[PDB]
Design an enzyme around this catalytic site. Structure first.
Site, PDB file in Angstrom:
ATOM      1  N   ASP A   1       0.147   6.084  -0.231  1.00 29.31           N
ATOM      2  CA  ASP A   1      -0.034   7.529  -0.175  1.00 29.31           C
ATOM      3  C   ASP A   1      -0.219   8.026   1.260  1.00 29.31           C
ATOM      4  O   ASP A   1       0.199   9.149   1.572  1.00 29.31           O
ATOM      5  CB  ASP A   1      -1.172   7.952  -1.103  1.00 29.31           C
ATOM      6  CG  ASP A   1      -0.908   7.707  -2.592  1.00 29.31           C
ATOM      7  OD1 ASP A   1       0.264   7.948  -3.025  1.00 29.31           O
ATOM      8  OD2 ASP A   1      -1.877   7.305  -3.329  1.00 29.31           O
TER       9      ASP A   1
ATOM     10  N   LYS B   1      -2.619  10.399  -6.507  1.00 28.90           N
ATOM     11  CA  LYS B   1      -1.595  10.277  -5.488  1.00 28.90           C
ATOM     12  C   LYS B   1      -1.301  11.592  -4.771  1.00 28.90           C
ATOM     13  O   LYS B   1      -1.155  11.618  -3.554  1.00 28.90           O
ATOM     14  CB  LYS B   1      -0.298   9.773  -6.136  1.00 28.90           C
ATOM     15  CG  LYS B   1      -0.383   8.321  -6.613  1.00 28.90           C
ATOM     16  CD  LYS B   1       0.908   7.930  -7.341  1.00 28.90           C
ATOM     17  CE  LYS B   1       0.800   6.584  -8.016  1.00 28.90           C
ATOM     18  NZ  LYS B   1       0.476   5.513  -7.070  1.00 28.90           N
TER      19      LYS B   1
ATOM     20  N   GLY C   1       5.309  -2.815   1.916  1.00 26.50           N
ATOM     21  CA  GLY C   1       3.995  -3.273   2.323  1.00 26.50           C
ATOM     22  C   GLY C   1       3.884  -3.370   3.842  1.00 26.50           C
ATOM     23  O   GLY C   1       4.213  -2.454   4.586  1.00 26.50           O
ATOM     24  N   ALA C   2       3.418  -4.519   4.289  1.00 25.18           N
ATOM     25  CA  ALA C   2       3.232  -4.823   5.696  1.00 25.18           C
ATOM     26  C   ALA C   2       4.560  -4.966   6.446  1.00 25.18           C
ATOM     27  O   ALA C   2       4.551  -5.045   7.674  1.00 25.18           O
ATOM     28  CB  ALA C   2       2.474  -6.120   5.786  1.00 25.18           C
TER      29      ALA C   2
ATOM     30  N   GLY D   1       6.985  -2.772   6.514  1.00 27.53           N
ATOM     31  CA  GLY D   1       7.639  -1.523   6.861  1.00 27.53           C
ATOM     32  C   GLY D   1       8.366  -0.929   5.666  1.00 27.53           C
ATOM     33  O   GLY D   1       7.778  -0.814   4.583  1.00 27.53           O
TER      34      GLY D   1
ATOM     35  N   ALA E   1      -9.176   0.172   7.436  1.00 24.98           N
ATOM     36  CA  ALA E   1     -10.489   0.663   7.036  1.00 24.98           C
ATOM     37  C   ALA E   1     -10.671   0.619   5.519  1.00 24.98           C
ATOM     38  O   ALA E   1      -9.715   0.721   4.755  1.00 24.98           O
ATOM     39  CB  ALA E   1     -10.714   2.070   7.551  1.00 24.98           C
TER      40      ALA E   1
HETATM   41  K   LIG Z   1      -7.638   1.616   3.202  1.00 23.43           K
END
Ligand SMILES: [K+]
Ligand SMILES: [K+]
Lengths: 314, 309
Positions: free
Chosen positions: A255, A40, A223-224, A226, A290
């Site tokens: 991270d 981390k 998470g998604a 915010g 990615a």
């Molecule tokens: K990633």
């Protein structure tokens, strides 16, 4: 002069790809093995550096092949390795990861040399910590060593960004009182508070519990969805949302967020919390688009100009 | 120095995490120790034979990576010829990722990697060294076509074939039996190969007979601490070779110690009875279980009783 100093962990990722996860007692075959760079602390330092921070990683790896490779990884990301220690007394920290084709995993972390980062090491790094704008730490080294880093930073008026990850139920109270910015995810907040944290609303109840333990600022990521933030100055939870993206691989997103936030605290201290968090949410959401962990973290030159304006933006 | 033992087989990096609890799906857990070791059944066997004094050659393929460079060094340090230890950029060195709890239960993920890319062209380069050896040793950790060609080459030259069907698969190519002078496996492997339950020396005798009738000349089934059972075309009645009780520290690698010892005796002590070779090999493998680790545990000639030599 390093503006962002990360006192924390480096881990070699040892990854096997399989078609199914093994259960206890099973031997299976996988189809691919590869090595990556994790931890981390290093992950956060990498995101900050890629956004343009002058960073320094205070950490301990083994006097071993993995350790030498990790120092090279740091250098390749333009991170100062002046305080990257080695030890013959433990192997470099490892994460043994088994991943199936749908991305479910089993992980075994052995902290290794990360736990040997010690008082003498921080005393040698005392000058670099003292001169930084932001000191970032987590809980992947010895907790007493993270506490010492926070103490040293506080004593010098350096902003502390504490990420209690992985979380421990009964953290020393001084962790909270030495934290200028305390940042965790839902699962960590559950461990720390004994509450359910699934939604923004739940996150604001958990955040207030943490604030009253003495943090200046509390941020819980969703998470998604915010994050939610509170502060001593502004104790009402604000929910900072994230525009929706198509996720490819969410590994390492947390991270990314923390590294982006460190960048803003150091280089744009004038900005409101809300502004810093919108920006940081956006950067982490680029990382999820990615494959991989550090490989996914974006560079400044590939990001929108509006992320780097000195003033508040709509 | 002409190699008497040639091993065509695997090299694997063992990546071992010790934990108090084994992870379930989706979990991250924290263990207390990690270590790297040199493993792979082929290399393990070659190392035990070399430490007993065999002149050996390891025919294998590792990656053009740190693990592979380290492996080649490991072989050289154990006095093994690496003339036909190849390196490839097309796969990583083979890996065994092993998670072990404090009660010794485990989760293991094997990625054979570069091992699988040792091909028949690579073998053909070793033709002269194979032809001059006394024993060829193969397992089931590389690509089957490559091991079959190695056994074939050995047979063409009158070199004794020692085959270890490990790990076992149910429907092994019949040529593995018919090309094997000495076929050696454990109880769990015999169960996979034959479909029979093996929970006694007598049961192992029955399983060994199936393997014999598939075309082996000599069949050995190892029984852990209970020694081994042997039968042959010339003597098809099973013989149980027992072993003295020892206190095991770590049984990992014991099978490969046994097979490497047997290779050494086949090559250097051909006039010993099979029963005598097996007593000695049982003893050497029982020394290995009395130390931690796999290759680290394999004894040297100088540290063993004179009567073994
Ligand atoms: K990633
Ligand atoms: K052993």
């Amino acid at each position: 002069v390093a503006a962002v100093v990360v006192v924390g962990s480096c881990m070699t990722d040892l990854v096997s790809l399989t078609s199914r996860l093994p259960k206890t007692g099973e031997t299976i075959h996988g189809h691919k093995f590869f090595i990556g760079f994790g931890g981390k602390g290093a992950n956060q330092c990498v995101q900050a550096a890629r956004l343009g921070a002058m960073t320094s990683m205070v950490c301990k790896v083994g006097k071993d092949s993995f350790g030498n490779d990790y120092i090279e990884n740091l250098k390749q990301n333009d991170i100062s390795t002046e305080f990257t220690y080695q030890t013959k007394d433990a192997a470099t920290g490892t994460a043994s990861i088994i991943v199936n084709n749908e991305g479910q995993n089993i992980i075994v972390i052995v902290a290794g040399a990360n736990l040997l980062l010690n008082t003498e090491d921080l005393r040698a790094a005392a000058n670099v910590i003292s001169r930084a704008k932001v000191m970032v730490c987590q809980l992947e080294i010895t907790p007493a060593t993270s506490l010492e880093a926070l103490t040293m930073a506080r004593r010098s008026g350096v902003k502390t960004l504490f990420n209690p990850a992985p979380a421990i139920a009964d953290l020393d109270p001084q962790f909270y009182t030495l934290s200028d910015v305390f940042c965790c995810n839902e699962s960590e907040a559950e461990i720390l508070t004994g509450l359910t944290v699934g939604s923004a609303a739940d996150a604001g109840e958990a955040a207030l519990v943490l604030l009253k333990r003495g943090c200046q600022v509390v941020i819980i990521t969703l998470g998604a969805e915010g994050c939610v933030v509170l502060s001593q100055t502004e104790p009402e939870p604000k929910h900072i949302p994230t525009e929706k993206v198509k996720a490819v691989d969410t590994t390492g997103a947390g991270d990314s967020f923390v590294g982006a936030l460190a960048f803003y605290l150091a280089y744009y201290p004038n900005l409101s919390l809300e502004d810093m968090l919108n920006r940081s949410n956006f950067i982490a959401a680029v990382s999820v688009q990615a494959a991989g962990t550090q490989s996914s973290y974006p560079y400044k030159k590939d990001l929108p100009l509006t992320l780097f304006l000195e003033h508040h933006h709509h």
